[PDB]
């Protein structure tokens, strides 16, 4: 069971900021890490897969990176429609595991 | 004759895991004699000898099981590439296990040997610590189909666990590739170059280990000797495919680290320019100053060195004047 | 080699066909049914509307852009009778050009390159061709290709293409790809010219980094072009039943094109190899000028300090140092030796 | 006229086999092999030692072989070649040997002739890689017993091509050890060994490419001497030659850059020595200048009258040395 | 198709494009089974009546600076003007063209001189028509003496049979005497490698680059020899009469072998520049090590000689057991520790 603990547990920022959420994995997931956005009351939306690749239709604001076992999600310019809970996932093994979340709020 | 070659002399133990269609027997022993009667039992048994520095035990089992004396040399010769040898009564396979320490980026090899004799398999290890815990759990807990199958399936299960541990090794090497890539791109240092050399050596060792393993698996499934049996061929083909994956990954990583080395390596001879620019500017600034200081510190007893207008601060200001002139002359050539 | 079957991949459910590329944006299917009578073009995103064209008598050109949709590829392969292993090879981008002959179709793998300026990068896109009876199936990853001339010829009845069968269409597509290889080679020649200028006129670390990028680009270019030569040779020599006997000379022409391309790549490799030594010599020249400045300064000033130390020792035992002078001799000797050294450096000119 | 520098030994070996049984012989008399060709069952005829042109011309006349291909057989420097004639097929291939602790590649030309149900082999040394085919014939392995002489030619060429893979493995090991030595042991012996390896690989690149053509000829032309149904086997050998060519040029690509790697490593070592010199000079010449400032002999000089002035000067020099070495530690040079 | 137009020249003139204008000689061999006639003629009229003579003849014209003679022969023998221009044009690549009546051949000769690693190039051109071989060469001294003495001795099938064997004999002699020069160059490069392994002096760069340029010229010459022998062998033009197809196939194989040899030897030569760079880099490293050690020991010693060599009104000299030898011993100790450090680091 690979454990992913992403920080901070909650983030507070305004528009135009560089909002960064980092994910830390206990084991060595190769690069199979994806990021999801969940506005409350709606299904999660896939944003970045393979830890660095932007999914089709997602705005170019978001970005992903990887230096070792820790992965980063960066929003270059926050916008009012990017205020939701962000999750981190690994699919290195067939037993997928999620992060605990990060609520970007005004 | 038949002297151990490796550097391990501490761990020694003998282990037998006799599993049946509906029964199971397991024990650990320290005497070679107690495991001998398991040769003739119908149900498959797994016999493990984790210390081969005790030569006498290896001779005893080799003589009891009637294996040729030639295989004993390879059993005790740890520094050897993987290989497979097909004989009338048994098949002799040489394999290897790897352990990677992330704190100290070094790769350690441990040889293992497998001999399939009809209704049993023998394993010889240099020390304690095996990658075959999952197959032990599968045997003990009646999960999977290893309990319903014969000893050829045991040889399969052990090799499958081996290649799975190879995958586990490749994950950590992947992490090292990533970290070293970003260091080399944005943080050029001596430590990064030393780490890159270590990683290149480790990948060369991996290549020389994995290609013979692929040939061993190919021989195992294509030739299918009588002991392999017809039903177990697709499983050996699956492990051959896994070895193909491992080899392709190794070649990709080796190419990546060579490409990492090349850019820094040719970036040399521009460090020479910087070093010489620094040396030239420092020498040009401080050599004439020392020369004039020695001249005006030179004593002759007939010099016009009387103070007149106080001249020590004047000469120091002159030193500053030529120093500033030299610095201004520099950065004109954008040095 | 024995029989062929899907290799088992660890970490994947058995029989899974997976796309191993990087492009996920585009999806499109083009149909161009043409004959001497009329052409019927068609562009859609429905896979069920191209399957009836399997039994068309007239030549057909189906172009499925975007193979990240593995379901579409599997559906087409099942309907057209393509083996699952050929589908796996279709979806395996990390491959090199090849040709396979079967009873009912011909399977070919090629490569498309697009050199880019302002970012010295050579990126490749895999293209697959299946010649099935009257149809020519084409699989691509992203929007953009090199087969616009063939489309124009089909549209305007220009040339021989509309009179002949589907194997001539396969000829035309392969010839278009090989033709664009020439434009790629011209672009890379321009890049080599610019880089060989930049090596000497401004040598820096980015120049050698670009040189190494170009050298690896040439290596992968060769690794791609050699299997192209082999596949064209196989096409015009083995000449399976699907390829008609009237089409082989065109494949011979394409094969000669491939040979010329290979020779060009070899010459480019030689030039790029020499570029490294050129760069090293230039940077060593700059270091040489810096070194000579240092040597001139040290040569002028060290002996003068040595002579100062000679006459700067308080050796009071001898009255030689106590000589009534106005300091003409020592300073004059230092000046004349300094100017002698300077003019000595003027000859054998260091400056 | 003979060309090879090998004249030590001369031997003849003959093998005749069929489904029922095999007849393996060995002798030196040329007269004993004359009745062997007429047998319907496939037979393998091997003659070793091309210095004695008398036996070569004797068997050429006896077997109806043209003198021109006989001259080709006697010549050794000929690159691989295949010639198709109505009676017989003439093929030329080379044999390579490589050793450790010494860097030499030796080429032993081997000439094959296929006619009727007899295969003729010509070679210089004693010993070759045609032992697996001999074992397959004598121990009833494979289908070689059920097949004709063209399949024997297939077996011979397949074994000869297969030995190239072992040669490539040995050369890969040598390339690896040279890569390490180039990277961290830059010496003159390294340069000499790199040159030797480059020349050997160029010789292999010379030899292997015509092998593709001579296998393609047997693949595609298929004159009636090749009994057919064996074309896929020659397809396999052609693919093997493709693989060998790819591996060989990968090796030459590595070897080309080996020397550049060595030169850059030498530059790195002299850079290290230069760094030592630069650090010492730049932290010492300024301090010598500071000391010389105070050493000047003047009647009046400010700050000669100060409480422990000499310790203050020493403290100033210590401070400047510390700041310089801290700057260098920041620079990562030291 | 007609004479190319040059800006400097008048519209129709043909110009020699070489350096050799010293000698003029014509040699005519009318060799036959019954007998042969040999003679040297300083004028061009004597060779004209052999245009349509049944007996084969071999005309060797030495000295092409006399454009008059060459174009007189061309007008008399039916040679097209462009072929005449290319005969005069020494600056050229070897090539052959096929016409309705004659076959034109261009292929060069090389000579080598001791103590001067210079590779010359003599433009010798061959014309095959009826039963005549016309040879135009720049200067006296040829490589075809063995064929001439073979004809004079009557030995060999070339005298008994047609003149296409004479063309084959000339070409074979030229390719054969490439090998004397090639052997001389191989011996020179082997001995040169001996000195460069012994003495890597300044002249080595110049000599190695001269040999590299020599190889470049040899490649630029040899590669056109195929697509010449290629045309002669595969294309089987009618003047060959198909009797000499193997006598062209063997020369094809010979030329392919020579091209492969030059391809290998180019890399062999480049390795020599690589070795020279290796040696000079090692010498520079040795110089750096020596300079660094000398400076490293002798600079702190200058610290001592300066700091204690200061003059001050109140200096803590503090003479302890005549501490001047003590300071000298301190300098000795620091020098010893420095040289020990250098030995341990193995710079020295
Ligand atoms: Mg001084
Ligand atoms: Mg240097
Ligand atoms: Mg003084």
From Swiss-Prot, chain E:
Major place of residence: membrane
Membrane topology listed for this record: Multi-pass membrane protein
Mutagenesis or variant effect for residue 324 to W: Abolishes pentamerization. Mildly decreases ion transport
Organism: Thermotoga maritima (strain ATCC 43589 / DSM 3109 / JCM 10099 / NBRC 100826 / MSB8)
Impact when changing residue 311 to Q: No effect on pentamerization. Abolishes ion transport
Cellular localisation: Cell inner membrane
Protein name in UniProt: Cobalt/magnesium transport protein CorA
One GO BP: magnesium ion transmembrane transport
């Amino acid at each position: 069971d690979i454990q992913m603990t992403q920080s901070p547990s909650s983030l507070s920022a305004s528009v135009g900021d560089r909002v960064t959420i980092t994910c830390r994995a206990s084991q060595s997931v190769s690069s199979a890490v994806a990021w999801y956005q969940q506005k409350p009351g709606k299904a999660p939306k896939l944003l970045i897969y393979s830890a660095s690749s932007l999914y089709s239709g997602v705005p170019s604001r978001f970005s992903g990176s990887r230096s070792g076992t820790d992965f980063t999600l960066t929003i270059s310019s926050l916008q009012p429609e990017d205020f939701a809970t962000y999750y981190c996932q690994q699919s290195s093994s067939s037993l997928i595991t999620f992060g605990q979340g990060t609520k970007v709020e005004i | 004759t038949l002297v151990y070659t490796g550097k391990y002399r501490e761990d020694f133990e003998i282990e037998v895991m006799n599993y049946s269609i509906e029964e199971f027997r397991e024990f650990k022993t320290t005497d070679v004699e107690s495991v001998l009667p398991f040769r003739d039992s119908s149900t498959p048994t797994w016999i493990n000898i984790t210390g081969i520095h005790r030569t006498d035990v290896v001779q005893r089992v080799g003589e009891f099981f009637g294996i040729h004396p030639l295989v004993l040399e390879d059993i005790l010769n740890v520094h050897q590439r993987p290989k497979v040898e097909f004989f009338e009564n048994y098949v002799f396979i040489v394999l290897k296990m790897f352990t990677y320490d992330k704190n100290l980026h070094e790769l350690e090899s441990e040889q293992v040997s497998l001999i399939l004799t009809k209704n049993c398999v023998l394993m010889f290890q240099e020390k304690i610590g095996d990658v075959f815990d999952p197959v032990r759990e599968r045997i003990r807990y009646n999960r999977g189909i290893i309990r319903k199958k014969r000893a050829d399936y045991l040889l399969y299960s052990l090799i499958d666990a081996l290649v799975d541990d190879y995958f586990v090794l490749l994950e950590k090497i992947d992490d090292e590739i990533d970290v070293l890539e970003e260091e080399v791109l944005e943080r050029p240092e001596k430590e990064t170059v030393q780490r890159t050399h270590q990683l290149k050596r480790n990948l060369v060792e991996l290549r020389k280990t994995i290609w013979p393993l692929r040939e061993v698996l190919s021989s195992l499934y294509r030739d299918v000797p009588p002991l392999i049996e017809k039903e177990t061929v697709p499983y050996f083909r699956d492990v051959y495919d896994h070895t193909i994956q491992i080899a392709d990954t190794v070649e990709t990583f080796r190419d990546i680290v060579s490409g990492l080395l090349d850019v820094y390596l040719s970036s040399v001879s521009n460090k020479t320019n910087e070093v010489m620019k620094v040396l030239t500017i420092i020498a040009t600034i401080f050599m004439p100053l020392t020369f004039i200081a020695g001249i005006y510190g030179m004593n002759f007893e007939y010099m016009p060195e009387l103070r007149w207008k106080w001249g020590y601060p004047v000469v120091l200001a002159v030193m500053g004047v030529i120093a500033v002139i030299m610095v201004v002359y520099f950065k004109k050539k954008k040095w």
